Amino acid sequence: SAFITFEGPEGSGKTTVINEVYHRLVKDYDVIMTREPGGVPTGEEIRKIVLEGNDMDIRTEAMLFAASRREHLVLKVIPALKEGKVVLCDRYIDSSLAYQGYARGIGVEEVRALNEFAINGLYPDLTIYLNVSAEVGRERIIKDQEDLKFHEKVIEGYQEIIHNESQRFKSVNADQPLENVVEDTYQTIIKYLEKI
Amino acid sequence: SAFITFEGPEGSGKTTVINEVYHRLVKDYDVIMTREPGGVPTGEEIRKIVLEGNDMDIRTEAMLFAASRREHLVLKVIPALKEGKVVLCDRYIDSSLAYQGYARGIGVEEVRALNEFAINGLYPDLTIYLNVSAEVGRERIDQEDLKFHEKVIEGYQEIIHNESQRFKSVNADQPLENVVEDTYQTIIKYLEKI
Numbered sequence A: 001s002a003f004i005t006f007e008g009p010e011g012s013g014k015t016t017v018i019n020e021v022y023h024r025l026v027k028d029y030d031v032i033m034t035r036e037p038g039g040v041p042t043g044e045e046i047r048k049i050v051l052e053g054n055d056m057d058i059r060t061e062a063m064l065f066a067a068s069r070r071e072h073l074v075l076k077v078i079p080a081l082k083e084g085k086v087v088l089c090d091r092y093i094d095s096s097l098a099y100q101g102y103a104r105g106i107g108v109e110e111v112r113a114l115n116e117f118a119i120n121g122l123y124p125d126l127t128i129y130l131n132v133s134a135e136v137g138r139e140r141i142i143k144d145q146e147d148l149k150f151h152e153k154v155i156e157g158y159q160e161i162i163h164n165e166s167q168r169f170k171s172v173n174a175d176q177p178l179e180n181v182v183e184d185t186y187q188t189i190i191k192y193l194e195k196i
Numbered sequence B: 001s002a003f004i005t006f007e008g009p010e011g012s013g014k015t016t017v018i019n020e021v022y023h024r025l026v027k028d029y030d031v032i033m034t035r036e037p038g039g040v041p042t043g044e045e046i047r048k049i050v051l052e053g054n055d056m057d058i059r060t061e062a063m064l065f066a067a068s069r070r071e072h073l074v075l076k077v078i079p080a081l082k083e084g085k086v087v088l089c090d091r092y093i094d095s096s097l098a099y100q101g102y103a104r105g106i107g108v109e110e111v112r113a114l115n116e117f118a119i120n121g122l123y124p125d126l127t128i129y130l131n132v133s134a135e136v137g138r139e140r141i142d143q144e145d146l147k148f149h150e151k152v153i154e155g156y157q158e159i160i161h162n163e164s165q166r167f168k169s170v171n172a173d174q175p176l177e178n179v180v181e182d183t184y185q186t187i188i189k190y191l192e193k194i
């Protein structure tokens, strides 16, 4: 089994990359694609609260992302791993670190301690970081100043997380055309998987 | 202003005591009594999720109690404290420490780290612990329920041993009129010294 997470800002080509990699991996592996809350009833109820939030306190929002994360992990991810599946997960702990910790200003270490409570040691086996520049990402989103700066800070946050901790992290150049980003991601995954 | 929390297992007469103490304190102080979620919409929605939980993972449950704690703190407690009020809160961080941390077995220090993210330094000024023996508590209320009850009491003892200065323990084995009186006097002594 393998728990593989995908990280990156918006405009990193993440949706295309996961879908195309899934289509190639299913030839050799029992693979699933997922994202939080991913159909888990409690997680879906949490998601409704977050999306209905009127200027929700950023720490309450972080705790709700973390509670949705745990429900998705325990009720969907772990049973799939037990079946021997390759789980392709769109966003996990690192999104809360980059978005809640860095971009929203809570503090990466405070958000880390919260999410370590949530995942209880279950870190991804492999994390694909779709490393897009802010300018390329901006163009992919189009195809506001506060939004542009928020997108910039998300990337700055990811840069901080990957520069500090790196072992499961595999950075893929997402400034390339998407066919190349798919090929580099697929090859990175196959290299990991074929080493058991 | 003062933020005073009330803690204890079931059977400690905690609800009755806080209600009576609050009714007496309103005569001399600008005071409110509340509990989580306490009407805050997001907290109420989180409460519904917890109550609807079918064998809910204990850490998800702890995170939801912590999210309800923050909403109630931010929208009710902090605005009242800024208005200079005495805030009486029935159950706070120590309830998550005793129940989720100790009794459910996640670990007090793990649950403390989670709750410190939720309260962001807003610990109670004073915590009233209604110290009921497991035997009196049992009587005031099967093997599993009695074992969980004893575990909560044991958890509260460990917490109070580690943070003696924040707690004031009231003998909850006495008749409730005495528990009310000792709790009231403990609070007044604290309020008249600040």
Ligand SMILES: CC[C@H](c1ccc(C(=O)O)c(Oc2cccc(Cl)c2)c1OC)N1CCC[C@H](n2cc(C)c(=O)[nH]c2=O)C1
Binding pocket: A036, A037, A046, A047, A050, A051, A064, A065, A066, A068, A091, A092, A095, A096, A099, A100
């Ligand atoms: C509004 C922010 C946005 C977003 C977009 C779509 C959904 C939606 O599902 O319709 C969404 O709701 C979610 C998603 C995941 C988990 C929950 Cl509980 C609610 C959402 O966050 C509220 N952004 C998009 C970029 C990534 C952001 N994000 C994601 C995760 C997983 C995290 O931990 N932190 C974070 O800020 C959310």
Ligand SMILES: CC[C@H](c1ccc(C(=O)O)c(Oc2cccc(Cl)c2)c1OC)N1CCC[C@H](n2cc(C)c(=O)[nH]c2=O)C1
Binding pocket: B036, B037, B043, B046, B047, B050, B051, B064, B065, B068, B091, B092, B095, B096, B099, B100
């Ligand atoms: C079933 C557990 C029970 C309890 C009783 C009544 C309510 C109810 O409101 O009807 C309740 O729901 C709540 C209460 C507070 C906050 C939320 Cl989000 C939900 C509840 O916990 C699910 N016990 C009773 C003993 C104390 C327990 N407790 C309380 C708090 C505040 C905590 O942090 N941890 C904990 O285990 C809950």
